[PDB]
Amino acid sequence: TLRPQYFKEYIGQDKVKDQLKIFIEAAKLRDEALDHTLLFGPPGLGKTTMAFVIANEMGVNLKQTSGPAIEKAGDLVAILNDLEPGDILFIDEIHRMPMAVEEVLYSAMEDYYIDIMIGAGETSRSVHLDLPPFTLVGATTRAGMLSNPLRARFGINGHMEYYELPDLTEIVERTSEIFEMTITPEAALELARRSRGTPRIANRLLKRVRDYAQIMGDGVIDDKIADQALTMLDVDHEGLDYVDQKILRTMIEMYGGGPVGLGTLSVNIAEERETVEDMYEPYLIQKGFIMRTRTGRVATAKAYEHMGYDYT
Amino acid sequence: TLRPQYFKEYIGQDKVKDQLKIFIEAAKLRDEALDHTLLFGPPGLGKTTMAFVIANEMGVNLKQTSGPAIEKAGDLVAILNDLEPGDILFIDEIHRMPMAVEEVLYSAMEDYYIDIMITSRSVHLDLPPFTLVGATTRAGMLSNPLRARFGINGHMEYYELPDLTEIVERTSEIFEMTITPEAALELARRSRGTPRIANRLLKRVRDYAQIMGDGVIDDKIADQALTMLDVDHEGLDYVDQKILRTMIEMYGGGPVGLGTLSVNIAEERETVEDMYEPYLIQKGFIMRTRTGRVATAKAYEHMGYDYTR
Amino acid sequence: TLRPQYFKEYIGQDKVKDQLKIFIEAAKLRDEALDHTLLFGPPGLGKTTMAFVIANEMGVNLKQTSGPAIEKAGDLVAILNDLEPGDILFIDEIHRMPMAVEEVLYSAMEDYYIDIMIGAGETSRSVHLDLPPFTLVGATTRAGMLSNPLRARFGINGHMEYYELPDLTEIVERTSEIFEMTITPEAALELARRSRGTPRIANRLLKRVRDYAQIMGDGVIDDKIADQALTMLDVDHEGLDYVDQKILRTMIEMYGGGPVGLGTLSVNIAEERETVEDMYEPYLIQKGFIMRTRTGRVATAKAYEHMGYDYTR
Amino acid sequence: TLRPQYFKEYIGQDKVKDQLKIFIEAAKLRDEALDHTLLFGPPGLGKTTMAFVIANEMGVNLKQTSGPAIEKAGDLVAILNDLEPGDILFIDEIHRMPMAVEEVLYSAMEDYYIDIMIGAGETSRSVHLDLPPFTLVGATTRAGMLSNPLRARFGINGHMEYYELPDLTEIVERTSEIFEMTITPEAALELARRSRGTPRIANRLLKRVRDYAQIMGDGVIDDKIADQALTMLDVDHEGLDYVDQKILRTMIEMYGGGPVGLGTLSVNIAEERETVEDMYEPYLIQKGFIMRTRTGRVATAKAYEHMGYDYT
Amino acid sequence: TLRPQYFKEYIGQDKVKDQLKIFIEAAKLRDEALDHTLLFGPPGLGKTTMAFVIANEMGVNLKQTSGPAIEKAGDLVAILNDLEPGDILFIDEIHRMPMAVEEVLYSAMEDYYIDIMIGAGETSRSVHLDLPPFTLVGATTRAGMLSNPLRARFGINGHMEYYELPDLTEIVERTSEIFEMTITPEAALELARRSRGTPRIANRLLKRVRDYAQIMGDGVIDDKIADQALTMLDVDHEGLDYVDQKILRTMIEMYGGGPVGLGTLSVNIAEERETVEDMYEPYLIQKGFIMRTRTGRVATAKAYEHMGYDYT
Amino acid sequence: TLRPQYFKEYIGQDKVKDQLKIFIEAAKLRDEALDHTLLFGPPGLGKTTMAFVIANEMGVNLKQTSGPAIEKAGDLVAILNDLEPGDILFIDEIHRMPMAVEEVLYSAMEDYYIDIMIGAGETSRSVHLDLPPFTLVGATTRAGMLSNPLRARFGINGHMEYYELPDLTEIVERTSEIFEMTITPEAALELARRSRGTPRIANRLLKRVRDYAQIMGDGVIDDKIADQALTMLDVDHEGLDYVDQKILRTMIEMYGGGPVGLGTLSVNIAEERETVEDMYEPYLIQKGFIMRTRTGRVATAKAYEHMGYDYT
Amino acid sequence: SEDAEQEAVAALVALGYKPQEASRMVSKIARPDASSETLIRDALRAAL
DNA sequence: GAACCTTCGAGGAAG
DNA sequence: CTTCCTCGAAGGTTC
Ligand SMILES: Nc1ncnc2c1ncn2[C@@H]1O[C@H](COP(=O)(O)OP(=O)(O)OP(O)(O)=S)[C@@H](O)[C@H]1O
Ligand SMILES: Nc1ncnc2c1ncn2[C@@H]1O[C@H](COP(=O)(O)OP(=O)(O)O)[C@@H](O)[C@H]1O
Ligand SMILES: Nc1ncnc2c1ncn2[C@@H]1O[C@H](COP(=O)(O)OP(=O)(O)O)[C@@H](O)[C@H]1O
Ligand SMILES: [Mg+2]
Ligand SMILES: [Mg+2]
Ligand SMILES: [Mg+2]
Ligand SMILES: [Mg+2]
């Protein structure tokens, strides 16, 4: 299967993985439910994949839903009240729940009970509905969008980190065995170093290289085919796309490296201001090719030697 | 039990706790009901816990509901009809009651009667003496005429290190865990002044001691557990340390804008502003300025860099 | 009870109180009802109580309701049928009445009769309804939102105003005698100074002081006990709460008086944006301690000399 | 019809056509659905046209809708229930969809399932909907408005480029045949040079010249007729408007080439400050007539020779 | 009723009244409806009264409504459909009606017809309704807030203005006689001076002064009584009201005479800026109590000496 | 009615008429509709009338609506569903249309189809509506205020300008012929001089002058009578309005001649910014009363001598 | 008297009451002989 | 003093 | 009714 199922198969995330192991083992010695867990961090690092692994290691059934599908308290109350002892409730994109619904979970998470209105007219009554022990697991990209009293109730916090070349190369090799393809250890490293640190991007590059190898090649991925395929996609050995290279080149040849404003640079590449700041500039800054200053953007020494100019 | 039941158990909150004792004792001496009390303040300081103490000190049975559940006047009218003389009604998250429900609550508090229309028919009720207790985090969201009817206002405050040290020891005995006095102190420094955070750290440290040790907490095991959780001696998280380091090493302490800093740490702008900055500004590690924010002298000494004016 | 019942006891509001007496007597010197009256003022000044006193001085029954309770014209016309000649109709929150009813009320006030039209329009006929004379008394917190045609029908206007120390002190003296406690005039004046000019607040402070004076003392409110009570409660001698002092102190010490944004101030004191904007900031503006500007809040010279800090432009 | 129907008719976009061909061929050999593809770039370059070409080459029927037509989750769920195995869904102007609905696609694109709430309301439960294999095609002008988790799920990215004079000349000739008009090869090149590298503009000018040639002429677009019609429309031989000529002339006559600030120039031309910067200045920079600098903007040598003044 | 019914009875407004006479009589000679008329100015000057006089001079039925009273096109269509040839429609506060209503008024006023769509989905229809000759009379307090395309449809304009002591003394005397009240030429001159140049206030004061004379006097309005009665009503010797006195006193005590903005002032005293700007500031400016400056309003020396504050 | 109906009757706008004649005639040889046309320029110059003339020349019906009237997509669909083959749809103030509504026209204009969700609940479904051929006509004050993808779809652009004194004189002579009246050439020229080169204003003043000449004169319009009638109105001896006098007075007295921004000015005269930007500022500039600078508008010495101040 | 009955029902509807409830309310009045004014007046008095 | 650029704060109208 | 976001301000640098 494409998604790992146990901690043996889950590569990387040593900090989060090592922590979860200790908490799972201690919970089993006490024969009690696991504490509530919140998983957050950048897109595509394995948040959803981890939520399933947690259920398998605990050996219990996993019930799944999503924030967008819950629209009113009546819906949530119907998901609850159907839970059995030790069940795990997983909610993806939990930040989309209406704030009027989040405030129902406040009592459920701390005391395992909820308030309900029942009856009609003079017969109406309010009673406590008592829930069995359970573990709520949430995954989100926008943790700052949750209410302050809700974040305070999660007992375990997992913040995901980017991967490194050794771990990504192993992921590429594993995926290359789900498909029925041979890949030379040198070719795998060449794709891993261009995947910007993210497993989803590594899998995407492999799929595209495969289509080439079986149309313009003999059906095997080797050092010769990888170089040709990556040249067609036009991805630099640092992962810089065609437009990424054009940005750095223009800063060096017309503005002498800057400083230059975002408006001035956008017009010279025919790109609109809102795409440059949200798609291309973020990775260039995080990798040290560009520096932001009060005067404008400036190219670093690292950018000069990568493009081949002289740092005069 | 994790929730204290009497004032002799409720640690801290000397200001609010001292006032409540005077008013409760006076109400008993006159055989009158307690005045309407509103509790408000930051999350996790004891607002819900205090409401249950007040009921036991008065010697009454507490009726409990919540704002999100009460959706229409018919709901509230049915609830009020179950009150007996001297009963206490506690409404949690009172800021969520619809405006229509709040209007009905005005006259119930001032004149102890309800006269409302609701196949429709009239209802008239004349209520016995009762005490309303409300708890909220967003007291600014209540209507101005409603706030004017509460008689006792209790504003909660953060705890000091000697108070939290005692709270940790109390919880340790419930789990029958053995903990040394200096180990309990090392958790207090990191608990940010909040009881819920102090209990959370203890639960995590217990799990470590039962798997990587002999199930006993000492000044040595605590250091290992806190190193795995990666919580600084000032209570800063891994991301909090990364923010300060970036500001000092890339911008000379600032000024720097929020957007620039967020992109440099690969975080969503809203997460830095709402989840990490509040504690840094309150402790005095960062200042906000017309042109950006800057790291203060305290940040340099804590992180270990040479300050230059 | 804590509500005065006649002009004999309604303390303060002398300007409005004096005018009403002359008009009410002139109405008695004729077989006529009083003109329609509208009361203006901030919340908690005694608007409701004044309506009841008007009815007693007239010696006529009073009907009580609020604008939101009148949802259709039939309700108003039905209520009008329950009135006897000369009865007073008191409608609170008159600014919240629905538009569809407002346009019909004009005829009742000026004409005391109503006409209703029926039929498709090609063939149509009316019905005429004659009403007993009455006087409408409206109470509202906001005058400007009342439409000009409605405003023209009200023949008497009465501004309520904040009570001054010489009058608010007497309310404390009076209330202290409904309970069983003796209170020294000096102590009563210390409570009045901190009551922000609102009777509801002065009553609330006195109740708390009474609790202290009978638990931490001999059951007498003397000036010494009053100081100790006003020390457990953190109410400043200018009426500032604990948090009001913390706001002003923060602005002066860390921002040099500002300008500073609402969001930056909120995170410094650890409070919610809504709470600072609606609970504390409104009273600080009336006293003139701060001002709102295009660039944020700013502290005034009045705040510097009150907190005791040197000033610099 | 004006719109091409197959890759053999789609002139230009050599880089985009080459990639799509390889991926479409590999998909057919495996007999599988094509990966999700996102088309983006400047207005009028041929995005909506290419979406139909992909469907014709794959040999499937196309289901069509638009971003603004979808307003709530109940709309999208209804559409997805109609997809058959191998169907292609095309969503134009995808950046307009609301965030509440955009987050529903996350599961459908990765795992082909949706979570829905069902039951009368007294009794209700969450259940999976399982979708057959399908290909989503999206077209957008403002890729930066899409959330990061959505862009990460598209497997093929197509960035459109402006057309060169040789290619744009062929489009003018092909269109003339559809209008049953006769055009001299020298006239086709005159229009192509004025079409700002954009196929829509080239077609608009041709349509106007055609109407003119049959009202005051003999029904043939000769080299002499073309000059008279283009003079009526006031289109310079570089594609400049009269407003653009006014800008360039002012800088040479009143400032000797600059530098000059945008605020000062706007007043001297009686044009709106922001209109000049957003509507006219972008093309003048891209063509090399004006150059921005830290002290202001300057007219280049190309602007002198085009106006006939003496460069110094 | 107190309001006059004919131009012979309408005192003052010589400018507006003289123009309307010419246009009203000329329309009779041609036997046709009067052009649309817009009346604007401070409240209480006689805008409503004037509309009734025009209707009586024309000999036509008058229909009345208000801006806030109309919420949807169907409401206005009913009113318009009930018109009879020559009827006058009077709309008060025409500046407050919704944008969706104004859509229909353009077509009606310009060509006397409307086009209302009806039906939905498979049902869709539009009714072309012809309207008989009619005249619209509009009234507003704010002229600059009226929609520009609407303001162009009005053919006659009437700018109302404040009354002088000779006219107000005649009005005060007239009104007293209707009540059969006896007032000497001396007391009537006091009320006119102290009634802010406005007939509505003058009538409002007279009813209150009557009550005082019926108790604190012998039913005869003496000059000595009028002064004591007006002072008891808190009406200044210059006619300034409670709000007027509070404005100037707040400027002198809290702002050293200003300059201060309209919003800031209206927030300190619990008053609406629309009220202060409509009823109070215009009067205070014409009489020199307030002056306008680039920084805001400033109190003149006259205000200082009247209020009894030593000038700086 | 006064509205012209054929190009022979439409005086002026020679440039626009000359171009439209060619395109309208060419579109009749072929049996097809005219391309989408865009008209822009100051208000009241006669672009609505131009839409009627085009429809009369084409021999089809004209439907009329406006930008602000189309609040939501379901409104526009109903309008489109009611067009007959070859009809003309005129949308006034198209720039003020909601953004999400504009995005629907993109398909209707370019391909004559729209994709719409119909029904409710389980009946929710997508239907591909096919539209008959039609011609859209848009009118707007600002060209640089439409979006780039909308502006790029209009095939014909028309710019309109103020009429010269010889043209307005003939328009007055025509209008004074529909009314059975007699006017001497001196009065016609004198009246046109006041009408700001705008036919709408000319017709309004002519009607008022006619009423005066019928009641206060011998029924004949002469230069002596025209001065008297115009002096009784607020029209200045060179066409300045009372609003213009208000503007110039404020600039000279309250700001010291300027420079001043229109944002602060608009709030001091209590006028909607759009009115001064569109209706007043353009005329005051095009006649030398106001001069523009980097910082804002400034009053010229010509203004000082007109208002009676000293240009020290 | 049927005219007065219909008039009272329509007049009550002209006051904003629903046609069904207005018919019942007026139908609930016993005396038919009383004039339409009394019928509407009685219905409104009973509805309080 | 002229011209660019970054950052913040309070409105206000589009879900 | 609430979130979002864009209009207008002013602080700082270079030439
Ligand atoms: N003149 C007065 N003398 C004594 N007590 C007074 C006086 N005016 C008000 N009070 C007290 O104030 C209390 C509240 O009065 P209210 O009539 O509610 O004022 P209010 O204007 O109605 O406030 P609202 O209606 O809630 S905005 C009363 O119960 C009295 O005890
Ligand atoms: N010229 C006048 N002659 C007689 N009475 C007048 C005159 N102007 C105003 N009034 C009186 O004052 C009041 C004016 O009200 P109204 O005409 O509605 O003013 P507005 O319409 O401007 O609010 C009426 O009572 C009216 O009789
Ligand atoms: N060239 C012209 N000849 C005769 N009358 C004209 C001419 N231009 C405009 N008009 C008249 O002046 C008025 C212009 O109104 P309209 O065409 O609606 O202007 P807009 O559409 O810009 O508001 C109409 O009464 C119209 O008949
Ligand atoms: Mg996921
Ligand atoms: Mg709680
Ligand atoms: Mg009250
Ligand atoms: Mg397209």
User: How many angstroms separate the CA atoms of B132 and B124, rounded?
Assistant: 20
Which residue type occupies D202? A
The structure tokens listed for A10 are 């889950």
Cis peptide preceding C199, ω within 30 of 0: no
Burial-class residue A308 by CB neighbours within 10 Å (0-12, 13-18, 19+). exposed
Does E199 sit in the ligand 2 pocket, CB within 6 Å? yes
The structure tokens listed for E255 are 């702002």
The torsion of the CA quartet E175, E181, E184, E186, rounded to 10 degrees, works out to -50
Enumerate residues 6+ apart whose C-beta is below 8 A from B87. B60, B61, B63, B128, B130, B131
Tell me the catalytic residues of E: 47-48, 92, 141, 200
Nearest nucleic acid nucleotide to F273, CA to C1' distance: I7
Burial-class residue E82 by CB neighbours within 10 Å (0-12, 13-18, 19+). exposed
User: How many angstroms separate the CA atoms of A235 and A238, rounded?
Assistant: 8
Of F173, F286, B112, the closest CA to residue D270 belongs to F286
| Chain A residue numbers touching D117 (CB-CB < 8 A) | 69-71, 75, 78
Burial string for B276-302 (b: 16+ CB within 10 Å, else e) reads bbebbbbbebbbbeeebbbbbeebbeb
Of E211, E138, E199, E212, the closest CA to residue E171 belongs to E199
Question: What count of other Cβ atoms lies within 10 Å of the Cβ of residue A234?
Answer: 13
Q: What is the sign, positive or negative, of the torsion defined by CA atoms of D163, D166, D167, D170?
A: positive
Q: What is the sign, positive or negative, of the torsion defined by CA atoms of C235, C239, C243, C248?
A: negative
Which residue type occupies A78? A
F103 touches chain D (CB under 8 A): yes
Give the structural domain span for G17: 1-48
User: How many angstroms separate the CA atoms of B174 and B183, rounded?
Assistant: 17
Of C288, D151, G39, B234, the closest CA to residue A279 belongs to D151
User: How many angstroms separate the CA atoms of E54 and E21, rounded?
Assistant: 9
Question: What count of other Cβ atoms lies within 10 Å of the Cβ of residue F219?
Answer: 10
- Helix (H, G, I), strand (E, B), or coil: what is residue F90? strand
User: How many angstroms separate the CA atoms of C237 and A4, rounded?
Assistant: 68
- Asked if residues F197 and F205 have their Cβ atoms less than 8 Å apart, the reply is no
- Helix (H, G, I), strand (E, B), or coil: what is residue B6? coil
Decide if A272 and D144 are in contact by the 8 Å CB cutoff. yes
- Strand D135-140 relative to strand D88-92, pairing: parallel
Q: What is the DSSP string of chain D?
A: --S--STTT--S-HHHHHHHHHHHHHHHHHT-PPPPEEEE-STTSSHHHHHHHHHHHHT--EEEEEGGG--SHHHHHHHHTTPPTT-EEEEETGGGS-HHHHTTHHHHHHHSEEEEEEESSSSEEEEEEEPPP-EEEEEES-GGGS-HHHHTT-SEEEE--PPPHHHHHHHHHHHHHHTT--B-HHHHHHHHHHTTT-HHHHHHHHHHHHHHHHHSSSS-B-HHHHHHHHHHTT--TTS--HHHHHHHHHHHHHHTT--B-HHHHHHHHT--HHHIIIIIHHHHHHTTSEEEETTEEEE-HHHHHHHTPPP-
User: How many angstroms separate the CA atoms of C19 and C159, rounded?
Assistant: 11
User: How many angstroms separate the CA atoms of D312 and E8, rounded?
Assistant: 82
User: What interhelical angle do E47-58 and E14-30 show, nearest 10?
Assistant: 30
- Asked if residues C270 and B42 have their Cβ atoms less than 8 Å apart, the reply is yes
Element (H, E) at E62: strand E62-66
Of B156, B134, B152, the closest CA to residue B143 belongs to B134
Nearest nucleic acid nucleotide to A295, CA to C1' distance: H5
The structure tokens listed for D223 are 């080299």
Enumerate residues 6+ apart whose C-beta is below 8 A from A52. A3, A5, A62
What are residue A114's DSSP bridge partners? Answer: A129
CA C266 → CA B61, B175, C155, C271, distances in Å? 38, 39, 47, 5
Please tell me what resolution, in angstroms, this structure has. 3.1
The structure tokens listed for D93 are 């102007």
Burial-class residue B120 by CB neighbours within 10 Å (0-12, 13-18, 19+). exposed
Q: What is the sign, positive or negative, of the torsion defined by CA atoms of E209, E210, E212, E217?
A: positive
User: How many angstroms separate the CA atoms of D175 and D163, rounded?
Assistant: 16
User: How many angstroms separate the CA atoms of A46 and A55, rounded?
Assistant: 15
Alpha helices in chain F (DSSP H): 14-29, 47-58, 73-80, 99-111, 148-151, 165-178, 185-194, 199-215, 223-232, 242-254, 262-269, 273-275, 281-285, 301-307
The structure tokens listed for G9 are 């029902």
| Chain G residue numbers touching C128 (CB-CB < 8 A) | 37
The structure tokens listed for F11 are 């005086």
User: How many angstroms separate the CA atoms of D181 and D214, rounded?
Assistant: 10
Flag residues 73-112 of F with CB < 7 Å from strand H.
Answer: 98-100
User: How many angstroms separate the CA atoms of D76 and D101, rounded?
Assistant: 8
User: How many angstroms separate the CA atoms of D157 and A201, rounded?
Assistant: 13
User: How many angstroms separate the CA atoms of F40 and B96, rounded?
Assistant: 52
User: How many angstroms separate the CA atoms of F235 and F238, rounded?
Assistant: 8
Which single residue is written with the structure tokens 């602000």? Answer: F68
Tally of domains within chain G: 1
Distance, first Cα to last Cα, chain B:
53
For chain A, the three-class secondary structure string (H helix, E strand, C coil) is CCCCCCCCCCCCCHHHHHHHHHHHHHHHHCCCCCCCEEEECCCCCCHHHHHHHHHHHHCCCEEEEEHHHCCCHHHHHHHCCCCCCCEEEEEECHHHCCHHHHHHHHHHHHHCEEEEEECCHHHCEEEEEECCCEEEEEEECCHHHCCHHHHCCCCEEEECCCCCHHHHHHHHHHHHHHCCCCECHHHHHHHHCCCCCCHHHHHHHHHHHHHHHCCCCCCCECHHHHHHHHHHHCCCCCCCCHHHHHHHHHHHHHCCCCCECHHHHHHHHCCCHHHHHHHHHHHHHHCCCEEEECCEEEECHHHHHHHCCCCC
Chains contacting G with at least 3 CB pairs below 8 Å? C
CA C150 → CA C47, C96, E140, F122, distances in Å? 20, 13, 17, 50
Cis peptide preceding A259, ω within 30 of 0: yes
State residue C80 phi and psi, 5-degree precision. Answer: -60, -30
User: How many angstroms separate the CA atoms of B185 and B165, rounded?
Assistant: 6
Cis peptide preceding E259, ω within 30 of 0: yes
- Strand E37-40 relative to strand E156-159, pairing: parallel
φ/ψ region of B127 (left if φ > 0, alpha if ψ in -120 to 50, else beta) reads: beta
- Asked if residues E45 and E285 have their Cβ atoms less than 8 Å apart, the reply is no
List the single protein residue with the shortest CA to C1' distance from H4: D294
What are residue A117's DSSP bridge partners? Answer: A126
Decide if G44 and C78 are in contact by the 8 Å CB cutoff. yes
- Asked if residues D100 and D106 have their Cβ atoms less than 8 Å apart, the reply is no
Delimit the domains of chain C by residue range: 1-162, 163-238, 239-313
User: How many angstroms separate the CA atoms of E15 and E23, rounded?
Assistant: 13
- Asked if residues B36 and B149 have their Cβ atoms less than 8 Å apart, the reply is yes
- Asked if residues A54 and A37 have their Cβ atoms less than 8 Å apart, the reply is yes
Instruction: Considering only the beta carbons, identify the residue of D119, D149, D155 that sits closest to A43.
Output: D149
Element (H, E) at E89: strand E88-92
The structure tokens listed for F310 are 């000293």
Question: What count of other Cβ atoms lies within 10 Å of the Cβ of residue G28?
Answer: 11
Instruction: Considering only the beta carbons, identify the residue of C216, C254, C279 that sits closest to B140.
Output: C279
Q: What angle do CA E295, E297, E301 make, to 5 degrees?
A: 120
The structure tokens listed for F42 are 């100051």
State residue C148 phi and psi, 5-degree precision. Answer: -60, -40
User: How many angstroms separate the CA atoms of F91 and F40, rounded?
Assistant: 12
CA D233 → CA D206, D227, D275, F141, distances in Å? 12, 10, 22, 21
Of E25, E303, E17, the closest CA to residue E161 belongs to E17
Of E141, E163, E159, the closest CA to residue E239 belongs to E163
Chains contacting C with at least 3 CB pairs below 8 Å? B, E, G
Q: What angle do CA A189, A192, A196 make, to 5 degrees?
A: 150
Question: What count of other Cβ atoms lies within 10 Å of the Cβ of residue F79?
Answer: 17
Flag residues 96-115 of D with CB < 7 Å from strand H.
Answer: 98, 100
Burial-class residue B261 by CB neighbours within 10 Å (0-12, 13-18, 19+). buried
D295 touches strand I (CB under 7 A): yes
User: Best of C10, C49, C137 to mutate for ligand 1, by most ligand atoms within 8 A of CB?
Assistant: C49
Q: After which residues is chain D broken (C to N over 2.5 A)?
A: none
B272 touches strand H (CB under 7 A): no
- Strand C62-66 relative to strand C88-92, pairing: parallel
Q: After which residues is chain B broken (C to N over 2.5 A)?
A: 118
Q: What angle do CA F210, F216, F222 make, to 5 degrees?
A: 55
The structure tokens listed for B278 are 């509040």
Of C62, D312, A49, D279, the closest CA to residue D271 belongs to D279
Burial-class residue A179 by CB neighbours within 10 Å (0-12, 13-18, 19+). exposed
- D291-297 — which CB contacts under 8 Å span 24+ positions? D292/A264, D292/A267, D293/D259, D295/D259, D296/D258, D296/D259, D296/D260, D296/D261, D297/D251, D297/D258, D297/D259, D297/D260, D297/D262, D297/D265
The structure tokens listed for B277 are 């900055």
The reply to whether F264 belongs to the active site is: no
What are residue F193's DSSP bridge partners? Answer: none
Which residue type occupies B46? G
Q: What single DSSP character describes residue C64?
A: E
CA F50 → CA B193, E108, F4, F218, distances in Å? 75, 20, 9, 37
Q: What is the sign, positive or negative, of the torsion defined by CA atoms of A143, A144, A145, A151?
A: positive
- Asked if residues B287 and B280 have their Cβ atoms less than 8 Å apart, the reply is no
User: How many angstroms separate the CA atoms of D184 and D221, rounded?
Assistant: 7
The structure tokens listed for D107 are 């599961």
Alpha-carbon Rg of chain B, whole angstroms?
25
Enumerate residues 6+ apart whose C-beta is below 8 A from A134. A33, A83, A85, A86, A87, A88, A89, A112
The structure tokens listed for B241 are 């340390």
Instruction: Considering only the beta carbons, identify the residue of C207, C214, C279 that sits closest to B139.
Output: C279
Enumerate residues 6+ apart whose C-beta is below 8 A from B309. none
User: How many angstroms separate the CA atoms of E18 and E4, rounded?
Assistant: 16
State residue A258 phi and psi, 5-degree precision. Answer: 100, -170
- Strand E37-40 relative to strand E62-66, pairing: unpaired
Strand I bases, protein C-beta under 7 A: 3, 8-15
User: What interhelical angle do D47-58 and D14-30 show, nearest 10?
Assistant: 30
